[PDB]
Amino acid sequence: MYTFVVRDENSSVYAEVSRLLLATGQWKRLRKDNPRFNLMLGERNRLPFGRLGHEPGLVQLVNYYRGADKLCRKASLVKLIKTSPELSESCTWFPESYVIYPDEREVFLAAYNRRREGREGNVWIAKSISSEASELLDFIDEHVIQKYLEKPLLLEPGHRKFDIRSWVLVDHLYNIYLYREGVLRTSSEPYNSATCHLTNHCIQKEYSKNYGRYEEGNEMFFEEFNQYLMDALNTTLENSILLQIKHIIRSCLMCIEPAISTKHLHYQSFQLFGFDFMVDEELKVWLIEVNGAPACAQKLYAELCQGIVDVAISSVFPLASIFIKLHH
Amino acid sequence: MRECISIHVGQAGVQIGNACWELYCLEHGIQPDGQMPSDKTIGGGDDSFNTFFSETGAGKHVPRAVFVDLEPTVIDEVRTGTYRQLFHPEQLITGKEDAANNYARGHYTIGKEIIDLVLDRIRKLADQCTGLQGFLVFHSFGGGTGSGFTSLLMERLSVDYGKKSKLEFSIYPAPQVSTAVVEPYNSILTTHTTLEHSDCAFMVDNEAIYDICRRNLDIERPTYTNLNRLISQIVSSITASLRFDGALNVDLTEFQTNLVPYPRIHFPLATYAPVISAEKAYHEQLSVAEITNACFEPANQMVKCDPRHGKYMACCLLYRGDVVPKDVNAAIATIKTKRSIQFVDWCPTGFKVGINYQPPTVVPGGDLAKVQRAVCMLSNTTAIAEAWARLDHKFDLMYAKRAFVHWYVGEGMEEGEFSEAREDMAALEKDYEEVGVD
Amino acid sequence: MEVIELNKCTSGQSFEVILKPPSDPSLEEIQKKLEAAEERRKYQEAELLKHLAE
Amino acid sequence: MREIVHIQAGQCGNQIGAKFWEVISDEHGIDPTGSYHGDSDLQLERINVYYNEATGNKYVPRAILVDLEPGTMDSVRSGPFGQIFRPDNFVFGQSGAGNNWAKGHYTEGAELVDSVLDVVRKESESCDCLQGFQLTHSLGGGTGSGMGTLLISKIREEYPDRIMNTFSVMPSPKVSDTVVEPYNATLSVHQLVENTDETYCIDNEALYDICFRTLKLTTPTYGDLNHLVSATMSGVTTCLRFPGQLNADLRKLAVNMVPFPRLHFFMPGFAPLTSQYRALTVPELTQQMFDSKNMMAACDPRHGRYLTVAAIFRGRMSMKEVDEQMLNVQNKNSSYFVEWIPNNVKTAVCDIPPRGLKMSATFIGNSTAIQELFKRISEQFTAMFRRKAFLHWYTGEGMDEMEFTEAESNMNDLVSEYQQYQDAT
Ligand SMILES: Nc1nc2c(ncn2[C@@H]2O[C@H](COP(=O)(O)OP(=O)(O)OP(=O)(O)O)[C@@H](O)[C@H]2O)c(=O)[nH]1
Ligand SMILES: Nc1ncnc2c1ncn2[C@@H]1O[C@H](COP(=O)(O)OP(=O)(O)CP(=O)(O)O)[C@@H](O)[C@H]1O
Ligand SMILES: Nc1nc2c(ncn2[C@@H]2O[C@H](COP(=O)(O)OP(=O)(O)O)[C@@H](O)[C@H]2O)c(=O)[nH]1
Ligand SMILES: [Ca+2]
Ligand SMILES: [Ca+2]
Ligand SMILES: [Ca+2]
Ligand SMILES: [Ca+2]
Ligand SMILES: [Mg+2]
Ligand SMILES: [Mg+2]
Ligand SMILES: [Mg+2]
Secondary structure (H helix, E strand, O other), rough: OEEEEEEEOOHHHHHHHHHHOOOOEEEOOOOOOOOOEEEEOOOOOOOOOHHOOOOOOOOEEEEOOOOOHHHOOOHHHHHHHHHHHOOOOOOOHHHEEEOOOOOOOHHHHHHHHHHHHHHOOOOEEOOOOOOOHHHHHHHHHEEEEEEEEOOOOOOOOOOOOEEEEEEEEOOOOOOOOEOOOOOEEEEEEEEEOOOOOOOOHHHHHHOOOOOOOOOHEEEEEEHHHHHHHHHOOOOOOOHHHHHHHHHHHHHHHHHHHHHHOOOOOOEOOEEEEEEEEEEOOOOOOEEEEOOOOOOOOOOHHHHHHHHHHHHHHHHOOOOOOOOOEEEE | OOOEOOOOHHHHHHHHHHHHHHHHHHHHHHOOOOEEOOOOOOOOOOOHHHHEEEEOOOEEEEEEEEEEEEEEEHHHHHHHOOOOOOOOHEEEEEEEEEEEOHHHHHHHHHHHHOOHHHHHHHHHHHHHHOOOEEEEEEOOOOHHHHHHHHHHHHHHHHHHHHOOOOEEEEEEOOOOOOOOHHHHHHHHHHHHHHHOOOEEEEEEEEEEEHHHHHOOOOOOOHHHHOOOHHHHHHHHHHHHHHHHHOOOOOOOHHHHHOOOOOOOOOEEEEEEEOEEEEOOOOOOOOOOHHHHHHHOOHHHHHOOOOOOOOEEEEEEEEEEOOOHHHHHOOOOOOHHHHOOEEOOOOOOOOEEEEOOOOOOOOOOOOOOOOOOEEEEEEEEEEEHHHHHHHHHHHHHHHOOOOOOHHHHHOOOHHHHHHHHHHHHHHHHHHHHHHHHOO | OEEEEEEOOOOOEEEEEEEEOOOOOOHHHOOOOHHOOOOHHHHHHHHHHHHHHH | OEEEEEEEEHHHHHHHHHHHHHHHHHHEEOOOOOEEEOOOOOHHHOOOOOEEEOOOHHHEEEEEEEEEOOOOHHHHHHHOHHHHHHHEEEEEEOOOOOOHHHHHHHHHHHHHHHHHHHHHHHHHHHOOOEEEEEEEOOOOOOOHHHHHHHHHHHHHHHHOOEEEEEEEEEEEOOEEOOOOOHHHHHHHHHHHHHHEEEEEEEEEEHHHHHHHHHHOOOOOOHHHHHHHHHHHHHOHHHHHHOOOOOOOOOOHHHHOEEEOOOOOOOEEEEEEOOOOOOOOOOOHHHHOOOHHHHHHOOOOHHOOOOOEEEEEOOOOOOHHHHHHHHHHHHHHHHHEOOOOOOOOOEEEEEOOOOOOOOOEEEEEEEEEHHHHHHHHHHHHHHHHHHOOOOOOOHHOOOOOOHHHHHHHHHHHHHHHHHHHHHHHH
């Protein structure tokens, strides 16, 4: 009999994981503060990594990688990509970005002034969209600024934007598992270069009349998107987009591996990641963000969560494929 | 030549001290009867080993050490053991009934009755010193004497030797070999009372030593004898600079200068390699690069923690055996491009290196195999605060219910000293996070 | 890197390699604590012996 | 030399006390004449905890035999090891106590108590470092219960800085002599709550069930019950009588086992309990040790939570395997161990096994389920007290009804105190 604790009630993914473990009859849940656990479904903030791996006779596993915030924070990612030689500023798959404190202000202007000088695309986005640098800087003082993909791939019918969410699982041995099923969080509004710009699933259901016109929940899954690519552009999702996604995933994860690996550590880590990608009109893939505590598509919760138990949990705690192993 | 006085307090301190002086004798070629053939200046001298050993007219080399325990049984072992001839009885101080794993009992009730006798015996050794530089104090956190009496002794020493340095070798409590449920209480209590009086303290977590013995020496259930043999190796490599010719950490003041920029943050993490079982007939001798790379594996640290998530303030590499500086720098260059080594912005990223050509000595018939070269890294990393957080958490669980507190109040201690010592620990954890976290 | 302060002798040598530049209470006050603790002990015992006398 | 002074009072106390000295005398290689004939230095390394050394290298138990009538003590003096006891340490009266706490505590007992304390003082004065005292007695009678607790109160007055330890036999209607046993036990428990540091609660109900259900004894006698008790007493004192690191003296044991001063009543357990040549593996000892059917207090451990536990394994065995099995018990049933006392289970291992066994395990638990024992006594007490039944036996000795009311309230407080910590998280 194995034991585990739940310390993140708001976790929808591991709520299902916790439900699956109990339904196995070979796992027992303890109080959130009972130390004699095998598995910790930890909280998102201030997880006490320092208290793990100090229980004699307990192989302890936690569902987060200590130090992974460097990859899953707006400013952290930008700094990691510019400062890591494994990635370098010669990173062809990451949008030109700059960290701005309410610092790289002078650098953001040096490149901004060159774009208005060159008369080329000079639209950016701020987060933690405008062609005027002053409006962005005045806004942050009330973050990060990267180039806004003004030439994005638009789905038809609709002439509309979207983004790609990929779920990546990393086990205690640091194998990279890419869930075969992704989702396109689409914008049900046509793209206007002068709600249709932010593909967020929440902004689409709250500020879009056409929420659900083309696809249910503004979510197009890979089976359909692949067929569209074949019918519209005479290509496959694998060749045109998925190769670049796999390349970006392992590049990012292999970069921080020396800093977060638990290979020789007194406790073990696994973690589910959410990568968000943008595709341009020329079928180039861009990394937008990495989510350290992502949710899953309603339809795929069952399959993904079951794969977490198979490869991430039962692999360390055996009982009595839906992933792609990105080798490295 | 400046002398150092070693003080061993409680069972842990006494038994560990017994293992270190045994190892010192083997290293300096001092026989159990105190005679030292290689010592040509009979009955005197100011050599490097004279910082730890005095000399009698008959040629005996006597450890500059005092053993203190509120119970006689442990120190009776030294009185009748192999090296009984080393010490004169004035150095071995024992009581009748111990502190019963009760800090308050060791500090107030029983400590008050024996503190003056220990000081007088220590004063006797200080009077034989032409230039005393300070003390090395060995003790456990968890015992009633090692925790309670040590903190009282450290207080009085600051009064009677305000200028002298004081270094600790502290045994951090581990349930796999612990003997009292209240050891977290005694740990916080003695760390709070001793903090201002200690210049540099090397914590050894029994958990880490235990697992090292099981994993690298193939000991199913290690005993104190197994643990203390290994701890004496680490202690020896740390004090070798005081006992041998050299230019790194030549006096106790240099330990503070090289390892402790912030006074309260005076707990360097010790990492040792290699640990090879003597049962392995043939073993591949590890290189300078391999044993240096091992200095950044948590599995080899004296306290299990992750320096990757934390910043460095200083780093010393102490090599014993066949090591030349060229190989050290080559190994360091390689490691810097593969490890996560972050220093605080206000500190240089570097290593103070010391090499002693004499390879490590091993107790004949012990568990550690002879090796061609070994290294002890001393790194002041903020990651060692993980041990404080673990300890303060166990403290909080029990104290919220006042569990066992009556044992301490009954000895004259006030309940407020608990939260005061806990507040001090809370501040200590805050300091570490300021220095190590962005 | 940069090697500095190289010192050599018969028994070994030491040096420093840099990879990158940066960017008490008195005896009286103690005695009052001890005697105060011993006082509380005697008080608590006296109250016990008072309870036993009753 | 941390000497312990043993006291046994009343019929029950002197009968279990005598068996206890027969058992440990054999373990330490001492014969009925006081001479040593063992083959291991471990037998004598801590022999001074319970034995005085006399002329001719004789070993004399540091035991004081007390009773208000000579009957049981005359039997002890003629028993197997009767001659080993110091003659001057037999302190006895003639009137008896009539199974009456008031007689032992206030009238008949008061006349004899000073004589006992004279012998206690002579034993203590010659102690290099006196640990404290251990008393064997029952709570349902008059001498052991009434005079036993009077002795405890007067010993504490003269030796307030010494540990007070008792083996207290709890009455049960299943194994009962008189109907007033709940009165005597309730009055005694209040004394114990205040004036002992450690009390092993030995329930005659548990002893009988083990003899009947487990050992297959259809008609158990007191002699059968005492065989379990003397075997348990040998186990719980193993750490005191042999060299060791854990719970090796009375005060360190109390520091590990008593988180709150009044909650010092322990459930003892023993394994194996067999009706016999078969080898008992380390996993088997551990499961049986924590099995309620091996407990001596007739309380369900799963009805409460463990504040603290002391375990002792005796015999040649794998200490590695012992550590593994103890960790398995806690990690498998961690809900029954309070989480606000980390690492509250301590384990000791002694190389010398008890007589007849290659391996044994003794369990000492501070569980909140012990409240079931005090609730049982409180219900039986109240059933009679509400009608003042049998009170005249006590008012005739000078006691007032108020003192019964206070003893009732005190034990109900004790039950409420245990319930408080059974819900703490
Ligand atoms: N490494 C090591 N740890 C020890 C040794 N002896 C005891 N300990 C640890 O020290 C703690 C117990 O404290 P002790 O040193 O035995 O107690 P004490 O200082 O003698 O004080 P008293 O309570 O009066 O006996 C526990 O955590 C033990 O695991 C030893 O020889 N080596
Ligand atoms: N550089 C860029 N170019 C083009 N579109 C961009 C962009 N940066 C962001 N976007 C758009 O803005 C949307 C929201 O981006 P953002 O990374 O802030 O989502 P978010 O982090 O606030 C919620 P989640 O964590 O689920 O992704 C993206 O889905 C995308 O449509
Ligand atoms: N286990 C055990 N219990 C006993 C023995 N003798 C009496 N008792 C119990 O002790 C209680 C009676 O106390 P007793 O010792 O006979 O009275 P006392 O002589 O005045 O102390 C009853 O609950 C009996 O069940 C015995 O030899 N063994
Ligand atoms: Ca000399
Ligand atoms: Ca000072
Ligand atoms: Ca009379
Ligand atoms: Ca008298
Ligand atoms: Mg986000
Ligand atoms: Mg001790
Ligand atoms: Mg009777």
